[PDB]
Design a binder for this molecule. Sequence first.
Ligand SMILES: C[C@H]1SC(N)=N[C@](C)(c2cc(NC(=O)c3cc4c(cn3)OCCO4)ccc2F)[C@H]1F
Length: 379
Amino acid sequence: RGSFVEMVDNLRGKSGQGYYVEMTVGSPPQTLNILVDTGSSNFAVGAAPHPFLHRYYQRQLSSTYRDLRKGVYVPYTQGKWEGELGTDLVSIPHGPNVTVRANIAAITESDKFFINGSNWEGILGLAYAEIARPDDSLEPFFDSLVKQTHVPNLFSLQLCGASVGGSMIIGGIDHSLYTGSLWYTPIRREWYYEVIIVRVEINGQDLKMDCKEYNYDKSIVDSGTTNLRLPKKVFEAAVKSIKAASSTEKFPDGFWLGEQLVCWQAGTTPWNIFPVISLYLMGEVTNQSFRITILPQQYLRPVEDVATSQDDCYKFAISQSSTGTVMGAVIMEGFYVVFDRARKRIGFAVSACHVHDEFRTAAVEGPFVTLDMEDCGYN
Ligand SMILES: C[C@H]1SC(N)=N[C@](C)(c2cc(NC(=O)c3cc4c(cn3)OCCO4)ccc2F)[C@H]1F
């Protein structure tokens, strides 16, 4: 506990493409790069020669593969994948020295799922059984890992960003990955990693909305989403405030809606024109909260693949949502995040690797006095 040198820097990725960990499946071990995803609950891997894939799971080569004789069809809002369920032996080379028999969805058909040019071939769904497909009887990977081994029921994520890197500490916390203290928010319900936001500030200025709006219909912590996604009404108020605070320069309306990029000359991004964003999260104690604060370095994201521009272009990575608040990479890149499943709580601390400048730093601060925090949750 406390120090896990072998798991430090076990995450890789490229801008806009996610964070993946190396895993092995089957006997003899087949190496795959697997997207780390706290926003879903299936372990699902490419199993057929899709042209976008560097490699795929070849079940015929595994002596320990067991067929579950069941299919699964998983439609997303935009993409889809279809697979055949089975179990096999799974290990994480730069994780704990253990081997687990886990459920694997062998992906046999997909659409808009794999990314052309990405270096991952599967997704590790780290959330709970309640949102696993086809149903909650398909035990998620981490549940299998904890049941079958002596690995503690906790993992932590340091997502670094701006090619990317970071650490997934399985079964522990590594104190070198953060500064200051961890502050914990309760996991409201074990399905997604659901949390409650009690207050929102832009540059210290309160949005003054009914706090139910912040969590309509839920708020989640999701390593598998890029953006900070906010409920439509909250996004409207947030953008209005961000526009006002950033009034020194004017931008087209499309930029704020993520419909167009905005570009600047290299090394001349005016970060200081853009405001900080603070989310107050429900604390561990009645009437107690804490505040997490991100910078423009988190929410204005570089787009490097612009062939029609020589300048440095950025995507506004705060967007409107119909699925509630999503605390994606925009949030998580500022922080070391502890998914303390054993105690049904999520810890936040300032990330030792977060991108900042000489004037401002991402922050985790408390305690604050906040009343009626239970009323902020949507029912
Ligand atoms: C709808 C999503 S949300 C979801 N949570 N999981 C599913 C399993 C899903 C996710 C992804 N994610 C990414 O590609 C990606 C990219 C990032 C990034 C994070 N994630 O942060 C740094 C910048 O780039 C891709 C496919 C996919 F199916 C879906 F449920």
